[PDB]
Design a protein around this nucleic acid. Structure first.
Ligand SMILES: [K+]
Ligand SMILES: [K+]
Ligand SMILES: [K+]
Ligand SMILES: [K+]
Ligand SMILES: [K+]
Ligand SMILES: [K+]
Ligand SMILES: [Mg+2]
Ligand SMILES: [Mg+2]
Ligand SMILES: [Mg+2]
Ligand SMILES: [Mg+2]
Ligand SMILES: [Mg+2]
Ligand SMILES: [Mg+2]
Ligand SMILES: [Mg+2]
Ligand SMILES: [Mg+2]
Ligand SMILES: [Mg+2]
Ligand SMILES: [Mg+2]
Ligand SMILES: [Mg+2]
Ligand SMILES: [Mg+2]
Ligand SMILES: [Mg+2]
Ligand SMILES: [Mg+2]
Ligand SMILES: [Mg+2]
Ligand SMILES: [Mg+2]
Ligand SMILES: [Mg+2]
Ligand SMILES: [Mg+2]
Ligand SMILES: [Mg+2]
Ligand SMILES: [Mg+2]
Ligand SMILES: [Mg+2]
Ligand SMILES: [Zn+2]
Lengths: 95, 88, 180, 50, 50, 235, 46, 57, 29, 49
RNA sequence: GACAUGAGUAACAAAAAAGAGUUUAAGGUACCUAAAAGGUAUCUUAGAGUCUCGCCUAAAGCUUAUGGCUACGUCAAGUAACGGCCUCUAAGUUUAUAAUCUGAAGAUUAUGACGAUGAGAAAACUUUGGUACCAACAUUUAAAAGUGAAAAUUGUGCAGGAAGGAUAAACCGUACCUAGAAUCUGAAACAA
RNA sequence: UCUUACUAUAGUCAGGACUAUAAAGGUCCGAACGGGUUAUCGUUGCAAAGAUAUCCGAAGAACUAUGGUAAGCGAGUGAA
RNA sequence: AUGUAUUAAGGAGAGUAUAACUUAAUUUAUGUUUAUGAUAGAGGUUAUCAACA
């Protein structure tokens, strides 16, 4: 070989037991006779809520101009834990 | 190519990948008729249920855009790739 | 609420993946749906992703990885590398699905197909002329396509030779003050 | 180069010239020509006089 | 922990030092490709003058 | 030495017109055979049940067809039924993920296994005369002679549409010595009842017209157990 | 003169001899990596 | 070669008696009057007549 | 207008260059 | 989106339950990232030992 | 580094071999026709096919490996009709552990781990030591007959012929090329 | 990854003949395969070791495949 | 090349708005000064027409 040998070896180039995965993840365990048992505690599911009646869309009309919050006089305006706890009392006291 | 077409269910789940049921892609002039992205200030007033449902509206919108891009190239429909990039 | 299959326990609330629905092959039945999925996607995911998000039941899944040509980092210069491969998945839908047929070339005016075709030909002729130079050859003058400038000088030649027009010295070759 | 073209009317990010005002050409063959700015390309700092 | 902050500061510096080496190289490739595309307009002006 | 026929109008023995070239229909080109004029031909020298059902498998991507008497195909079928149609066009084996049942023919006679072995014989001889002696597709239809040897071999592999038109012909009495006739010779003859099971409802429309002795049913026995659902046009 | 010594060469013997694991796990192999890493090489092994 | 061939001697070999000879055995075609070669058929009439006998006959 | 900066733009800008050429032909008559 | 929907305020702070399911935090940031600055008291306690 | 000379010379000769029609796309000419167009004929570039003839043929054919600067729509729970991954281990390897030796580096023995070129349940449905052994050689055996394997049976010779474990379907491979006609190694489109 | 020796696991040797054997032979004729005896060609070659014919071995000290071990103060391997 | 000042672990792979760099690949806020600066408009993609901390 001259130059292809100097590239990164892939699974599409050799077949003598060279297994390289694609980081899909472990969905189970290997058996002793060459099979696979799927452990459904490692399998992943996607939680998609009901979208019937939902009015929000991924775009906002350009007539409404973009504005950023001010939080005047506070360094940690949006991350202030005091304005989140004090705001919690008035709005939601129970939970 | 001359067989009677099968009746595909109107409310098929795979119809959500298409913009128009006749041409998978949307016309470039009607593909740019969209607003702007949500600002962080506007999203701070939304609950988890609103932000969890809105995320999936964006996911399905990107899956719909990627479907129109792949069709336009293969079917040689025309221009429109520059407008889908801004919408995406 | 009862899925046809067995659902996993790891919940993914905000998946960032992009699933592309590609047109099937000519001879494929109408119960096969091909998708482009991330390289980390597995058959169990698509089956769960197509039912909770799109409400599509599938009886089986097939997957295959498509490699990408090795390339140089910057065009014809740079180190030699290989892009990330592409994963395609084919679902055996429980309900058939048929795609629409592409519009006729003359009915693609909404996409500006007229102007796009002109530009495509120009690029098609640029890569064809560059391929003639990569073989160590050039297009002889006799084969060059006559442009609009050469079609206009052949009509003038027939007008002067015939006698319709009379030749006169140029007046815009240069703007001299002498005018002689 | 973008700063040099705008030197007489501020800086590229603080531009004191806007489309709609009449300007006078001071270079080229069409010197002392007067027209109205139609467009204003802020990338190359070029102006169009129709 | 004071020892956990040094870990983050070092990581931030390493990735910031790598983006500058790549950015610097990219700026020269584009500048070289832009100057070569502009040189096509200079050659035309020089040819028309001669 | 071989002799290829020409795409010229000819008469058919079937009750229907198989192709536009067919001049006449239901024409007796030979006296009724031994078993043709028999109300109940039986499985004389074959296993019990053989000939009552006939399966047809097809490649879902390339269209290659295989006929088998048993519910499953083996490597013998691929070698003895697939002619060479070019390089990289004849599979070295049968891939479970590509081959599916196309249809299944069931005769009314629950023990007339000899009637099925005849239908299976005409289907295999028609398929051979479709890959060979395809004079009706050279300059018309698919125009195989106007294609390259590569593309021509890919169109010859697609025998699924032809196979469906072969079923409507054989089941309508096409062929000489077809045992799906029944001559009384008291001399009135008729066609035997048959049933066709389809995995795809749209796959039965390749035949321009079907006979009056065939009934169409969706789904093949044993398919549902494999979690393979049939395709229905009506839905 | 030279000989065709790479005829019949396999890519499994290239990873066992000049691979990356053959160098990080050996005292003399850490030198090669450090030497090649100091020079600026991209292909440290194989 | 012992010495490099000079310009004089290499020009002697290349052009002395090796000039391209001008073809003078030309004559017009009787069917169309085009310049054909002596004793040869007109290529413009050959193809046309060869294609004219293929359509009608 | 380059050969490679003609398809990377939107149809709005591509059609704005045709109006330029259209109004450029009405002045030549 | 309509102006009435973008202006509607639906977020109510909570104190005894997280704003969203605790599992969502792993998708927002990488738990094992070397850039993580918000650790748990148990982790720091083990680091100090 | 550029450019000369030899020189417009040698070479494009594996003792297979070609001949005559047809046709598609784009473009170049001449005429027809001057309403642009189109038509007829021809040439160029990139192809495709038909009839006849010949060459290879236990190949220069088909199916596949090693391999690949050829190209990315190549699709499998398993068997019929599949490999890897996975389990077990050989020759060996070990910056693993313990003990020991040792100018340092290290080395040694044991154990562990790893390591195929070998062994791995079932399916046209499925999940003790000749009471032996499966090296070589010969013999016999799926009953209409013959032939070729597989596995087993019996016997022969000395050169005396492994180890270990058992016993509802993820992930990876799947395209093309096999060297006489465009792809592997020989610096290459090489008579190897 | 060449090559030499060893090593582990595997594979191959049409057909015929003689010999005490059905199978006991560094036996015989001769393909595959493995060698490279003589000759011509080639020598900026098709080839930095090739082509043609001829010749030798071809059940053995045989040949081949995938791995492994031993090489550079001392010399690894060596039917030398 | 030398000098001065500060600092004390370095690289690669793949991907991404091709000045913007890590799947959030152009995040979100504070303070001051803004032509007497610093060294009474238009413009949220026809964008980033603002620098320092
Ligand atoms: K490969
Ligand atoms: K040597
Ligand atoms: K993230
Ligand atoms: K498998
Ligand atoms: K030591
Ligand atoms: K010589
Ligand atoms: Mg292994
Ligand atoms: Mg697969
Ligand atoms: Mg293949
Ligand atoms: Mg070798
Ligand atoms: Mg952080
Ligand atoms: Mg000479
Ligand atoms: Mg000569
Ligand atoms: Mg010569
Ligand atoms: Mg032409
Ligand atoms: Mg390979
Ligand atoms: Mg082990
Ligand atoms: Mg093995
Ligand atoms: Mg060769
Ligand atoms: Mg050869
Ligand atoms: Mg080569
Ligand atoms: Mg070796
Ligand atoms: Mg002997
Ligand atoms: Mg012999
Ligand atoms: Mg020797
Ligand atoms: Mg010698
Ligand atoms: Mg001898
Ligand atoms: Zn003439």
């Amino acid at each position: 070989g001259l130059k292809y040998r100097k590239l990164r070896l892939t699974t599409k180039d050799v077949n003598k037991g060279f297994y390289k995965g694609n980081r899909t993840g472990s969905m189970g365990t290997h058996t002793s006779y060459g099979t696979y048992k799927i452990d459904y505690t490692k399998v992943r599911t996607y939680v998609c809520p009901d979208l019937t009646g939902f009015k929000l869309t991924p775009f906002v009309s350009k007539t409404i101009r973009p504005v950023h919050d001010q939080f005047p006089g506070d360094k940690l305006g949006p991350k202030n834990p005091a304005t989140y706890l004090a705001r919690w009392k008035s709005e939601n006291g129970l939970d | 190519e001359e067989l009677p077409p099968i009746q595909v269910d109107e409310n098929h789940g795979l119809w959500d990948f298409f913009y128009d049921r006749e041409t998978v892609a949307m016309a470039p002039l009607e593909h740019t008729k969209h607003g702007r992205a949500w600002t962080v200030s506007e999203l701070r007033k939304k609950s988890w249920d609103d932000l969890h449902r809105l995320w999936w509206v964006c996911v399905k919108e990107r899956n719909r855009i990627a479907t129109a891009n792949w069709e336009r190239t293969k079917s040689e429909l025309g221009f429109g790739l520059a407008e889908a990039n801004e919408r995406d | 609420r009862n899925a046809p299959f067995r659902v996993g326990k790891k919940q993914i609330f905000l998946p960032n993946h992009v699933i592309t629905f590609v047109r099937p092959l000519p001879k494929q039945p109408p119960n096969l749906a091909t998708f482009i999925v991330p390289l980390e996607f597995n058959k169990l995911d698509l089956r769960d992703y197509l039912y909770h998000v799109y409400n599509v039941e599938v009886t089986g899944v097939r997957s295959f990885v498509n490699q990408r040509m090795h390339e140089q980092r910057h065009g014809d210069v740079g180190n030699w590398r290989r892009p990330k491969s592409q994963k395609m998945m084919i679902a055996e839908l429980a309900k058939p699905f048929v795609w629409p047929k592409p519009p006729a070339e003359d009915a693609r005016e909404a996409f500006d197909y007229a102007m796009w075709k002109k530009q495509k030909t120009a690029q098609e002729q640029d890569t064809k002329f560059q391929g003639i130079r990569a073989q160590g050859e050039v297009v002889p003058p006799s084969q060059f396509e006559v442009t609009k400038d050469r079609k206009a000088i052949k009509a003038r030649q027939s007008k002067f030779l015939s006698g319709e027009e009379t030749w006169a010295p140029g007046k815009v070759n240069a703007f001299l003050n002498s005018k002689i | 180069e973008r700063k040099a073209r705008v030197a007489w009317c501020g800086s590229p990010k603080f531009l004191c010239i806007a489309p709609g005002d009449r300007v006078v050409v001071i270079e080229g063959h069409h010197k002392d020509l007067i027209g109205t700015i139609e467009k204003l390309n802020t990338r190359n700092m070029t102006v169009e006089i129709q | 922990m004071d020892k956990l902050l040094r870990r983050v500061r070092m990581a931030e510096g390493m990735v910031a030092r790598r983006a500058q080496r790549k950015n610097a190289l990219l700026k020269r490739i584009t500048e070289r490709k832009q100057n070569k595309k502009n040189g096509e307009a200079f050659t035309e002006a020089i040819q028309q003058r001669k | 030495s071989t002799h290829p026929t020409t795409a010229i109008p000819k008469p058919t023995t079937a009750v229907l017109k198989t192709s536009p070239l067919a001049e006449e229909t239901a024409v007796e080109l030979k006296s009724p055979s031994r078993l043709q004029l028999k109300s109940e031909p039986g499985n004389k020298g074959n296993p019990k049940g053989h000939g009552d059902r006939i399966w047809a498998f097809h490649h879902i991507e390339q269209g290659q067809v295989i006929y088998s008497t048993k519910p499953v195909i083996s490597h013998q079928h691929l070698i003895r039924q697939q002619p060479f149609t070019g390089k990289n066009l004849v599979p070295r084996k049968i891939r479970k993920d590509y081959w599916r049942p196309l249809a299944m023919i069931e005769l009314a006679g629950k023990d007339q296994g000899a009637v099925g072995r005849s239908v299976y014989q005409k289907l295999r001889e028609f398929k051979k005369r479709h890959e060979l002696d395809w004079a009706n597709e050279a300059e018309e239809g698919r125009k195989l002679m106007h294609k390259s040897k590569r593309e021509r071999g890919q169109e010859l592999n697609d025998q699924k549409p032809n196979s469906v038109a072969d079923m409507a012909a054989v089941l309508a009495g096409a062929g000489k010595g077809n045992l799906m006739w029944q001559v009384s010779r008291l001399v009135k003859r008729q066609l035997r009842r048959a049933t066709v099971y389809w995995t795809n409802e749209q796959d039965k429309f390749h035949a321009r017209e079907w006979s009056d002795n065939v009934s169409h049913e969706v789904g093949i026995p044993g398919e549902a157990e494999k979690k393979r659902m049939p395709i229905r046009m009506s839905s | 003169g030279p000989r065709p010594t790479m005829s019949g060469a396999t890519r499994l013997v290239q990873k066992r001899r000049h691979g990356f694991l053959s160098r990080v796990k050996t005292k003399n192999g850490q030198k090669t990596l450090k030497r090649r890493l100091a020079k600026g090489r991209l292909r440290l092994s194989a | 070669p012992k010495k490099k061939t000079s310009h004089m001697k290499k020009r002697h070999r290349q052009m002395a008696g090796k000039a391209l000879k001008d073809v003078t055995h030309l004559n017009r075609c009787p069917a169309c009057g085009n310049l054909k070669r002596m004793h040869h058929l007109c290529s413009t009439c050959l193809g046309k007549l060869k294609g004219f006998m293929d359509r009608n006959g | 207008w380059s050969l490679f900066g003609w398809g990377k733009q939107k149809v709005e800008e591509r059609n704005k260059v045709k109006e330029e050429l259209k109004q450029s032909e009405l002045a030549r008559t | 989106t309509l102006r009435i929907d973008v202006d509607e305020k639906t977020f109510v702070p909570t104190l005894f339950r997280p704003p969203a399911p605790q599992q969502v935090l792993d998708e927002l940031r990488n738990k094992y990232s070397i850039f993580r600055t918000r650790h748990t008291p148990e982790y720091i306690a083990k680091k100090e030992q």
